[PDB]
Amino acid sequence: RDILKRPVITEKSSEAMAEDKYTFDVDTRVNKTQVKMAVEEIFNVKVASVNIMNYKPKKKRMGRYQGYTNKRRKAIVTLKEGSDDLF
């Protein structure tokens, strides 16, 4: 389903997109077997591998008040056919 949240557009991810790799933001409590089936169901491609990782919340401040950002789970998808999962 809508496991995916947003795509990741950075300098390192741009170098990944030249070799059939795509970086997304997924839900914090899903495994990469669900992410594998979610990509093929939406974009109609054939996935070959998924690697996934976690980042901790970061300390942030504005004015005097201090808080934390959201924790996130990042998935990198390797395809064997198809591309252009965004513009």
Binding site: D2, K5, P7, I9, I42, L86, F87
Partner: protein
């Protein structure tokens, strides 16, 4: 107080919220990420239609 005009039958109530989430919520949300999306009030409008389609379907029980 809002405007509800969903007179559809059950077989058509299910498909209303499959089309309204596949493109009217998921396609509008990747456009805001990479950046192509003007007129951003569409996102909030669609989310309330999904809420409307579920309140009415549940009263049918």
């Amino acid at each position: 107080m809002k405007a509800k005009e969903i007179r559809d039958l059950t077989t058509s109530e299910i498909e209303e919220q499959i089309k309204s989430s596949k493109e009217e919520l998921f396609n509008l949300r990747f456009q805001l990420a990479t950046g192509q999306l003007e007129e951003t009030a569409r996102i909030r409008t669609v989310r309330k239609t999904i809420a409307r389609l579920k309140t009415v379907a549940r009263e049918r029980e």
